[PDB]
Each structure stands twice: as C-alpha cells, then as structure tokens.
Amino acid sequence: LKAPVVVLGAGLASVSFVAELRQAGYQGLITVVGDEAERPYDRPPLSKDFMAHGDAEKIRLDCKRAPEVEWLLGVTAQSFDPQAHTVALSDGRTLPYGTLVLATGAAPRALPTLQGATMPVHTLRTLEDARRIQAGLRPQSRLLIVGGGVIGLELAATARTAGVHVSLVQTKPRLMSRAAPATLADFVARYHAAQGVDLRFERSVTGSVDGVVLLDDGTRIAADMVVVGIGVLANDALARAAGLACDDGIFVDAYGRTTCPDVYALGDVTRQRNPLSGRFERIETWSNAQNQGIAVARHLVDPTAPGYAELPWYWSDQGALRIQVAGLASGDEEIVRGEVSLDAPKFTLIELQKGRIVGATCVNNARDFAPLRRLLAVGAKPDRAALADPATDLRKLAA
Amino acid sequence: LKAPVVVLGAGLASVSFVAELRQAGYQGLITVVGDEAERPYDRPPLSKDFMAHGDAEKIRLDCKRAPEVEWLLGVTAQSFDPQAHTVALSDGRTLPYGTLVLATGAAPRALPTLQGATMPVHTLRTLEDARRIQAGLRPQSRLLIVGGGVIGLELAATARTAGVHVSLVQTKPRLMSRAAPATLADFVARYHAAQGVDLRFERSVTGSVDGVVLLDDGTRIAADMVVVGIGVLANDALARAAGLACDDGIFVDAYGRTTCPDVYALGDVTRQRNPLSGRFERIETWSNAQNQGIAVARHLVDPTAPGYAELPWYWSDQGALRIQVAGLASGDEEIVRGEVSLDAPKFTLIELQKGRIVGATCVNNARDFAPLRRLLAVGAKPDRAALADPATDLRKLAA
Numbered sequence: 001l002k003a004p005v006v007v008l009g010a011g012l013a014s015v016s017f018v019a020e021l022r023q024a025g026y027q028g029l030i031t032v033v034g035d036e037a038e039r040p041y042d043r044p045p046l047s048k049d050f051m052a053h054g055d056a057e058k059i060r061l062d063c064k065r066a067p068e069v070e071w072l073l074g075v076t077a078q079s080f081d082p083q084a085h086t087v088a089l090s091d092g093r094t095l096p097y098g099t100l101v102l103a104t105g106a107a108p109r110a111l112p113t114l115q116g117a118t119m120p121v122h123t124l125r126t127l128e129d130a131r132r133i134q135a136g137l138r139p140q141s142r143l144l145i146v147g148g149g150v151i152g153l154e155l156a157a158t159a160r161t162a163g164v165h166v167s168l169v170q171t172k173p174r175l176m177s178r179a180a181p182a183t184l185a186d187f188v189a190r191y192h193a194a195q196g197v198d199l200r201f202e203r204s205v206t207g208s209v210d211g212v213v214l215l216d217d218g219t220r221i222a223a224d225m226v227v228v229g230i231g232v233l234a235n236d237a238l239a240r241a242a243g244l245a246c247d248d249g250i251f252v253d254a255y256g257r258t259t260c261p262d263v264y265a266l267g268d269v270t271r272q273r274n275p276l277s278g279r280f281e282r283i284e285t286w287s288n289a290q291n292q293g294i295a296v297a298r299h300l301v302d303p304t305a306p307g308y309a310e311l312p313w314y315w316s317d318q319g320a321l322r323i324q325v326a327g328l329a330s331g332d333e334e335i336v337r338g339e340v341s342l343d344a345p346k347f348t349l350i351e352l353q354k355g356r357i358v359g360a361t362c363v364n365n366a367r368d369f370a371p372l373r374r375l376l377a378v379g380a381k382p383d384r385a386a387l388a389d390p391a392t393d394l395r396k397l398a399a
Numbered sequence: 400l401k402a403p404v405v406v407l408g409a410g411l412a413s414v415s416f417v418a419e420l421r422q423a424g425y426q427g428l429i430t431v432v433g434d435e436a437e438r439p440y441d442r443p444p445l446s447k448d449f450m451a452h453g454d455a456e457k458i459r460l461d462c463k464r465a466p467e468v469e470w471l472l473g474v475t476a477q478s479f480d481p482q483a484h485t486v487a488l489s490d491g492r493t494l495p496y497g498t499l500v501l502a503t504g505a506a507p508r509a510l511p512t513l514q515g516a517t518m519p520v521h522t523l524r525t526l527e528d529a530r531r532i533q534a535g536l537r538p539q540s541r542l543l544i545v546g547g548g549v550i551g552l553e554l555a556a557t558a559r560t561a562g563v564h565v566s567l568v569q570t571k572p573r574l575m576s577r578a579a580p581a582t583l584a585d586f587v588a589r590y591h592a593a594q595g596v597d598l599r600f601e602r603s604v605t606g607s608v609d610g611v612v613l614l615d616d617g618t619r620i621a622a623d624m625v626v627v628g629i630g631v632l633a634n635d636a637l638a639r640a641a642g643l644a645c646d647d648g649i650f651v652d653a654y655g656r657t658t659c660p661d662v663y664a665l666g667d668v669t670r671q672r673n674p675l676s677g678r679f680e681r682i683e684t685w686s687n688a689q690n691q692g693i694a695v696a697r698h699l700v701d702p703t704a705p706g707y708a709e710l711p712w713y714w715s716d717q718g719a720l721r722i723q724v725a726g727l728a729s730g731d732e733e734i735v736r737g738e739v740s741l742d743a744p745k746f747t748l749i750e751l752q753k754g755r756i757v758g759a760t761c762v763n764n765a766r767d768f769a770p771l772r773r774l775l776a777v778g779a780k781p782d783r784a785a786l787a788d789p790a791t792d793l794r795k796l797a798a
C-alpha cells in the first residue's frame with residue numbers, strides 16, 4: 001500500500017474498496033475516476049424498482065464510510081503508464097499513483113446481427129440505459145428481450161407487471177445457463193410462461209428489417225423495442241494496453257494483484273479463482289463486487305489479513321420469485337426440499353458432490369439460504385436423509 | 400532484474416532462459432534447482448531416436464552459453480516465501496533470491512481407471528520413463544497406447560519400426576484433437592493404420608484386470624504394457640501455495656510476470672496469451688519453451704526489449720511423416736497445396752480467416768514452412784488463387 005491511491009471506475013466494487021481502506025485505517029490520498037457523470041449508484045434496481053418507479057435517488061450508494069475521497073465523475077481514464085506510475089485522463093489531467101486499482105467493471109456485449117438495425121435496440125447496464133428503456137415502455141407495447149440470463153428475466157417480469165407484451169429469445173435450450181441448476185432453470189421458464197412471456201428456445205437472431213427481428217429458424221418477431229442481454233465483456237482495455245495478463249478479464253490472485261507491480265483489480269473486470277471448482281472465472285455477481293473489493297482493501301492495509309475467500313453466490317428478483325443461488329449448479333446428486341409448484345412457489349435445492357454440499361438454491365425461502373451458505377463454506381457432509389427430511393431445521397444443523 | 404537469480408526447473412525453458420541472461424550481459428549469481436538427477440537434456444528424442452538407440456549423451460542440452468551457473472541436480476524446491484525472498488530445498492538448504500523464475504514444466508496426467516492396475520503402466524516424460532519403456536519393448540510384444548496426441552503417435556511409429564504390435568485408444572473422434580487441422584488428423588490416422596497400428600476411436604479406458612484393458616464399449620484389449628499419454632498438468636504447486644494466480648498453469652503476461660512481485664514463470668508451466676486467438680492457453684510446444692525463455696530473459700536484462708511475441712508452432716516426427724504445424728487449426732477456409740496421398744506423402748495446408756493467413760501445416764515439406772510462418776507472423780492476405788497455384792513459390796511471395 002503505497003500512497004496515493006487511484007481507483008479507476010466508480011461502481012459498487014470501487015465504492016466498497018475505498019470505504020474499506022478508510023475504515024481499515026488508510027488516511028492517505030484516494031482519488032476515484034468514474035466515466036459516468038452520476039453520483040455512484042447500484043445497478044440491480046435498474047431492472048426492477050427503478051424501471052418501474054423511476055427515482056434514482058433511491059439507488060445511490062452510500063459513500064459516507066469513504067470520507068476525504070475525491071470522485072472525478074464524468075471523466076475517462078484513457079491509459080496508464082505503469083513505469084511512470086501515472087494515469088492519463090480524458091480532461092487532459094494526469095494523476096500520479098503509488099497504488100493503482102482497476103475497478104472498471106464490464107459492458108454489455110453487442111449483437112453483431114443488430115449492428116445496423118433501424119429500430120430501437122438497447123442494452124441494460126446504466127442509469128442512462130434504464131431511462132431510455134423506460135421511455136419506450138408503454139402499456140401494450142411489444143418488447144423483445146434477447147438473452148435468458150437474470151437481467152433479461154428480471155426486466156421481463158417488470159415489463160409484464162407494467163402491461164408490456166414480452167417475447168424472449170434464448171439461444172441455449174434453458175434459461176440461466178450460467179450458474180443455475182437445471183431444475184431451477186426449468187421452473188423459472190414455467191413461471192415466466194405462466195405470466196405471459198413468449199419464450200423461444202434454441203433460436204438465434206440473424207438480423208432485422210423495418211421493425212421486425214429475424215431468427216435462425218427462418219421466422220420473424222415484430223417488436224417496438226429490442227433489449228439485448230446476452231452477457232457482458234470485461235472493461236479491460238487499459239490493462240491490455242499496459243501489458244497486464246487479461247483474457248476478457250484481468251487475471252488476479254486472492255490479494256487482487258495483477259501481473260503488473262503496484263496495479264490491482266477487483267469486481268466485474270477480474271478473472272479470479274473459484275474455490276469450489278478450482279478454476280478461474282469472471283464472477284459477475286453483486287456479492288463478489290462488494291466482498292472482493294473489501295477483501296483486497298483489507299489486505300492492502302493489513303497484509304496479515306487473509307486473501308479474498310468467499311464462495312460465489314447471487315440473487316435475482318423475478319416477479320413473485322425471490323431467487324437465491326450459491327456454489328456450483330450441479331454435483332453428483334440434487335436434494336429437493338419442498339414442492340416445485342407454481343402455486344405459491346417455495347423450495348430449496350441442494351447440490352452434493354461425494355456427500356459434500358457444493359451448491360444450494362432457495363426460491364422464496366431466504367431463511368434457509370444463510371445456513372446453507374455456511375454449510376457450503378466449510379464443505380459440510382450432512383446426512384442426506386436429514387437434508388431431504390422437511391422436519392430438519394437447516395439453521396440447527398448448521399451448528 | 401534483482402540479483403541473485405534462482406530458477407526452479409532445469410528443462411529446456413530453464414536452460415534457454417539462463418543462457419540468454421548470460422548472453423544479454425547479466426553476470427550476477429544464477430542458481431538452478433532441478434529435481435531430476437540428470438544432466439539437463441531434451442525430451443523429443445525420448446519418443447524417437449533415444450527410444451530406438453538408447454544413447455542419452457546424444458540428447459543433452461548445451462549449457463556452454465550459460466557459464467558460471469550452479470545447477471543443483473536431484474534436488475526439489477519444496478516451497479518459496481515471496482515475502483522473505485527465499486526458496487526451501489529438499490536437501491535442507493535455503494536459497495535467497497532477488498528474482499525467482501518458475502520453469503517447472505508439466506507432468507503426465509494419470510489415468511484414474513488404471514490407478515490400481517497390476518500390469519505395467521507407464522507415462523512418457525522423462526529419461527527414466529523412456530528407459531523403463533524400452534526395457535519392456537521386445538519385438539512382437541503388444542503395446543497399448545492410451546491417447547492420440549503427438550507423443551503417443553511418435554511412440555507408436557517407433558514401436559512399430561521395432562517390430563512391436565501397437566494398439567491405440569483415443570477418446571476423441573480424431574487424433575491430435577489439440578492444435579491440428581482435421582485434414583491433417585484424418586491423414587495421420589490413415590498413415591498409422593497403414594503401418595499396422597490398431598486404432599480405436601471414441602473409446603475410453605474403464606479399468607483393467609490381470610493384463611487386459613477394459614473399454615467403455617464393453618470390450619477388452621490384452622497388452623504386455625500400457626503407455627498413457629492423455630496430456631499433461633502444469634507443475635504449479637509451489638505457485639499455488641505461495642498465492643500466485645494459477646489454473647493448471649501459472650498466469651503470466653508477455654514479460655513472464657506472475658501476479659507475485661519478483662516472481663516470473665516460463666515454458667510448459669505457464670498459461671499465456673495466444674496472439675492469434677487472443678485467448679490464454681497453456682502452450683506446450685518445444686519452440687515456446689525455448690523462445691519464451693529467451694524473451695523473458697532478454698526483457699529482464701534490457702527492459703526496452705519487447706515482450707514475448709511469437710505465434711505458436713510445433714513439429715512431430717512420426718515415421719515417414721515429418722509434420723510441422725503453425726497457428727490455428729482452422730479458419731473460414733483451408734487451402735491445400737499438393738496431393739494428400741500415402742504414396743510418398745508431401746503436402747501443405749493453409750488456414751485462412753477473412754483472407755488473412757492464421758495457420759499452416761507442412762508434411763514432408765520443410766521448405767515451405769518457414770515462409771508460411773513469416774507470412775503468418777505479419778497477418779498476410781495473399782491471393783488465394785496464387786496460394787493454391789502450385790506454380791507459386793511461397794518463399795518468393797513471402798517478400
């Protein structure tokens with residue numbers, strides 16, 4: 001930890017990191033460069049309550065635990081020189097650094113087949129995106145969502161509740177193909193179909209003409225607006241140009257270190273080790289952005305602190321479904337607690353691998369999720385009969 | 400470049416690196432820790448001329464360009480402390496370092512289904528391995544090779560020439576599924592079949608009992624010896640324990656830097672960027688071990704030197720086939736020069752991607768390979784009609 005600290009990016013990972021530095025005792029200079037001209041804000045409401053109600057002052061991140069920080073908003077870091085220890089800014093200024101932190105997140109992947117489209121096509125990542133989408137979301141408008149990940153499905157539910165007709169195209173045979181158990185994915189499709197979502201599986205967009213989208217099966221979908229959500233790409237251009245190891249994501253170890261001395265990275269921009277799979281992955285969850293940011297800051301101030309160690313998890317709010325998912329999507333068996341029914345959905349899945357818990361899912365059952373995450377964390381091997389037994393209390397069993 | 404330099408591993412990458420340091424002008428301490436008790440030697444002859452003729456003094460690496468280096472042979476680096484800047488050795492000694500270089504290569508992957516086998520099962524990576532395999536290779540012995548990569552196929556040809564009966568099991572539908580064009584792979588299978596190799600595709604080993612190997616199709620193959628060659632795993636345990644970013648391979652940038660300050664890595668142990676694909680890969684070729692070793696050394700002595708930049712390539716000698724392959728295995732089209740015939744095989748493949756050369760293969764045509772590699776290097780876009788035209792001289796066209 002060499003002063004001054006410069007952080008590139010002012011999203012959740014960045015805010016979490018600078019607040020932990022200050023709370024841990026670092027009182028030297030901290031400067032944050034953020035390219036959006038927005039008071040730092042949280043993204044999950046953009047698909048839900050913001051999209052519906054429209055109040056951005058309900059979604060701002062609390063920067064109060066980060067006193068004495070200069071936030072350069074609406075400014076783009078254009079390059080950094082890791083030998084000179086400087087960053088070049090879009091406003092013509094240069095910042096010196098002792099420690100540089102790359103927290104630049106990721107940007108929506110574009111659909112090449114819609115690149116010359118003459119109809120409204122948006123992605124959903126920023127306040128500006130959400131505001132733009134809202135203003136075309138009239139009741140009985142027709143929305144096409146490309147991509148069956150959580151963002152798209154969250155938007156789908158919000159749109160339907162608002163009286164918008166929703167069609168959704170998914171290339172893979174299942175929704176949430178990333179980091180969701182098949183049982184959950186099948187149920188999620190059943191729910192959305194029941195809410196009026198027109199789901200098209202194993203189809204791809206081949207292009208568009210005069211307000212209609214074309215598909216690989218040779219068919220058409222007319223819509224007033226397309227929202228594309230087919231995943232994101234790490235914002236790692238600065239690192240690539242400066243000579244750091246990247247591959248759609250900056251490689252970091254558990255201390256947030258990149259291959260370049262005095263340069264760290266955290267959050268959506270990173271590829272990091274998933275302790276459960278033992279493989280490097282770009283983890284794009286809210287909890288990772290916050291918790292990896294805190295862990296890296298904590299170790300920078302106190303090098304005896306351990307590195308980042310959390311196992312990955314996320315939630316997704318999709319209408320009546322409060323979904324929570326932790327660990328791996330699959331193992332050698334799945335234990336199902338409760339019934340999988342559209343009639344007041346409430347159930348828990350547990351994935352096991354040689355008797356050890358390696359994954360869990362709760363749907364409208366937040367009470368069981370916390371003890372499942374603790375069990376997950378220690379690689380517990382409970383009695384599978386007790387794990388199926390609805391009489392069992394997971395909170396009790398967790399100690 | 401802080402003295403003293405310690406290198407872990409005494410294979411080709413290591414020898415190439417220390418020789419380049421010395422040639423570039425670094426005259427400080429260099430100490431190499433090598434766990435094999437062997438004068439440093441080259442591995443490719445182990446599947447060919449050594450396996451046949453048995454003279455290890457024909458395969459030693461030239462260390463003369465590396466004067467004043469202490470080589471601790473037969474000693475294992477057990478851990479390193481990247482804060483203390485020391486390495487702990489199996490003989491009880493500790494080495495201080497200013498710069499640590501991890502050049503520990505990779506080890507053959509084991510076959511879990513043969514873990515309790517009571518017949519001879521060997522891998523082929525070391526002098527000891529080769530010597531052990533040789534001594535069971537009687538004429539009219541039956542050898543089963545598991546794995547259709549280049550090592551297995553090279554051994555297959557050597558064994559057949561020696562009068563050994565060869566059966567070979569390959570899980571994938573084609574040989575050389577890694578980094579070889581399908582056209583080449585199909586031809587290579589045709590050649591080996593013509594030389595008496597009993598090839599079994601899309602089959603897996605399920606176990607063994609009393610001198611017979613069992614397969615996923617429910618059948619049997621009796622053999623006097625099994626040689627397993629199903630790929631390798633990076634020897635990255637020290638890095639993993641010391642907190643470096645690894646995933647079956649230590650992540651490095653173009654200067655050989657790991658995520659840990661003052662620690663570098665090179666050769667088979669690394670995952671690095673493939674400039675043609677833009678993706679990180681573990682490149683396990685001879686040319687990478689030598690050339691990445693030299694590039695990293697060169698930049699350590701002269702930081703104005705560029706980073707490692709070579710595009711990947713390899714050769715494989717399989718009986719009458721002198722095979723050379725560069726770049727990617729495929730693109731949007733393949734140009735074929737000459738005829739693909741078992742009657743005196745001699746042909747060239749060129750892979751193109753939007754008019755640009757991205758890959759090439761020569762079989763018994765070393766003359767065309769060098770100009771194809773130069774063309775590959777600059778991302779050339781020659782006239783495809785001229786590239787097919789046998790009247791065309793690639794050496795001429797290369798300038």
Ligand SMILES: Cc1cc2nc3c(=O)[nH]c(=O)nc-3n(C[C@H](O)[C@H](O)[C@H](O)COP(=O)(O)OP(=O)(O)OC[C@H]3O[C@@H](n4cnc5c(N)ncnc54)[C@H](O)[C@@H]3O)c2cc1C
Pocket residue numbers: 008009010011012013014033034035036042043044045046047075076077078103104105106124125126150151154235238266267268269284285286287289313314315316317
């Ligand atoms: C619509 C939506 C819904 C979501 N819902 C969920 C959910 O249900 N569950 C869940 O777990 N997560 C969800 N997420 C939230 C999410 O996971 C977090 O927003 C994200 O992980 C935060 O990571 P970050 O801080 O690393 O990156 P970012 O939030 O992307 O922050 C990076 C910032 O750096 C900026 N930047 C990039 N380059 C430069 C530069 N050169 N100079 C200056 N600034 C730069 C970027 O523009 C960006 O503002 C959702 C996200 C979206 C967009």
Ligand SMILES: Cc1cc2nc3c(=O)[nH]c(=O)nc-3n(C[C@H](O)[C@H](O)[C@H](O)COP(=O)(O)OP(=O)(O)OC[C@H]3O[C@@H](n4cnc5c(N)ncnc54)[C@H](O)[C@@H]3O)c2cc1C
Pocket residue numbers: 407408409410411412413432433434435441442443444445446474475476477502503504505523524525549550553634637665666667668683684685686688712713714715716
């Ligand atoms: C049978 C065979 C045939 C081949 N034929 C071809 C070919 O046709 N074409 C081709 O391109 N390549 C071929 N290769 C050659 C090959 O590509 C090179 O041998 C390899 O890439 C060299 O890389 P290296 O120096 O990084 O690793 P290595 O050669 O594996 O050297 C690493 C050394 O470090 C040692 N070590 C590991 N851990 C420790 C430790 N903790 N302490 C001390 N020492 C340690 C290892 O035991 C090993 O001796 C072949 C290899 C084999 C084995």
